[PDB]
Design a protein around this ligand. Structure first.
Ligand SMILES: CC(=O)N1CCc2nc(N3CCC(Oc4ccc(F)cc4F)CC3)c(N[C@@H]3CCOC3)nc2C1
Length: 357
């Protein structure tokens, strides 16, 4: 157990597992058009990052025993560096994709969103690969004037910069998650206000002998409906808007009795629409909850190492290194599992192949 070679073969098999599952997920995102939305494209990018993690550690074992050259091991640590950086970057990317999709989904138009998503993938993979290559350029720890970090051949200075960057990145991701929550809080609160106003309007319509009270209540009802529509395009209540338009038409041309009757008929469509929006908000809560779980798991798995690699002592037992990498490494293993157990849309494809086979 405390032995490093048994640990090494253990992590070798685990990284084989990790690379396989990540490759499967990337294939599903690339092959399924239903999974081609910004969110799932970014999720596939993270799958690729964890794939790189598994592949890099497999290669690091493969060479570690029976390697041709150290140069290659330096490149493979570049691999692991790139996997970590891509994972963290794409995680922030999914956070912002969620925040943008929910903040004002109408502004979540295809042009800027597809532009942003492809830009995010480019700026993530470019940066991550550049970092992974930096130790190749001469940013490693193999000099008589440079101290080696726990993960050779990475220097303590550069791993320290990586750790501090990761900490600040994680803090920013947390703030963005809280902004996301705020957005959803408001989307629900404004809807509750509109329900109060709409029920008050329907109530006050019945108790009025003047044709102008009906017009006022119907206009306020229309405004409330249009606000609720503005909240989230992401199954149509434009029908309710149209029924309110019919009621307004009748009300204007001196049709009080039948205008009130139409405002009553609005009750059926209002029941349907109010039943509708609740499912939407439940789905939003589910997606945001999955985001939160993923963030928590990533932090818990990596922060141990993120701290140790800097506070490491260069004379401590080897076990500490494992105890910090084992969470961090198996984070790549656990990430594929989460979405499957939770995200139903991609879980569908997971079970689809069995129908195929
Ligand atoms: C000798 C040996 O056992 N090797 C060779 C070197 C090695 N390097 C790893 N990475 C390198 C980059 C580093 O990134 C940072 C992470 C946190 C920081 F705060 C600052 C960093 F810079 C994380 C650790 C690593 N981790 C993998 C990643 C996926 O599962 C475990 N496994 C190994 C295996």
């Amino acid at each position: 157990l405390p032995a490093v070679n048994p640990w090494d073969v253990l992590l070798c098999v685990s990284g084989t597992v990790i690379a396989g599952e990540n490759a499967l997920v990337v294939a599903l995102i690339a092959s399924t058009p239903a999974l081609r939305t910004p969110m799932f494209v970014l999720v596939g990018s993270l799958a690729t990052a964890d794939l790189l993690a598994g592949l890099g550690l497999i290669l690091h074992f493969v060479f570690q025993y029976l390697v041709p050259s150290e140069t290659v091991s330096l490149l493979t640590v570049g691999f692991l560096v790139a996997s970590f950086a891509a994972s963290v970057s794409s995680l922030l990317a999914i956070t912002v994709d969620r925040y943008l999709s929910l903040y004002n989904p109408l502004t979540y138009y295809s042009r800027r969103t597809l532009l942003g998503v492809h830009l995010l993938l480019a700026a993530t993979w470019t940066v991550s690969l550049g970092l992974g290559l930096l130790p190749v350029l001469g940013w490693n720890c193999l000099a008589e004037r440079a101290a080696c970090s726990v993960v050779r051949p990475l220097a303590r200075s550069h791993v320290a910069l990586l750790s501090a960057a990761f900490f600040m990145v994680f803090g920013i991701m947390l703030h963005l998650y809280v902004r996301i929550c705020q957005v959803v809080w408001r989307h629900a609160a404004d809807l509750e206000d509109n329900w109060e106003t709409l029920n008050d309007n329907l109530k006050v319509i019945e108790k009025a002998d003047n044709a102008a009270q009906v017009k006022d209540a119907l206009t306020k009802m229309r405004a409330a409906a249009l606000d609720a529509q503005k909240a989230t395009p992401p199954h149509g209540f434009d029908i309710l808007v149209g029924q309110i338009d019919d009621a307004l038409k009748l009300a204007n041309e001196g049709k009080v009795k039948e205008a009130q009757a139409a405002a009553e008929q609005l009750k059926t469509t209002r029941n349907a629409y109010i039943q509708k929006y609740l499912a939407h908000l439940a789905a939003t809560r589910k997606g945001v909850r999955t985001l939160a779980v993923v963030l928590g798991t990533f932090g818990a798995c990596w922060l141990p190492f993120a701290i140790y690699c800097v506070v490491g002592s260069h004379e401590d037992p080897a076990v500490y290194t494992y105890a910090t990498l084992l969470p961090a490494t198996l984070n790549s293993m656990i990430n594929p599992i989460i979405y499957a157990f939770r995200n139903q849309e991609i879980q569908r494809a997971l079970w689809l192949l069995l129908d195929g086979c």
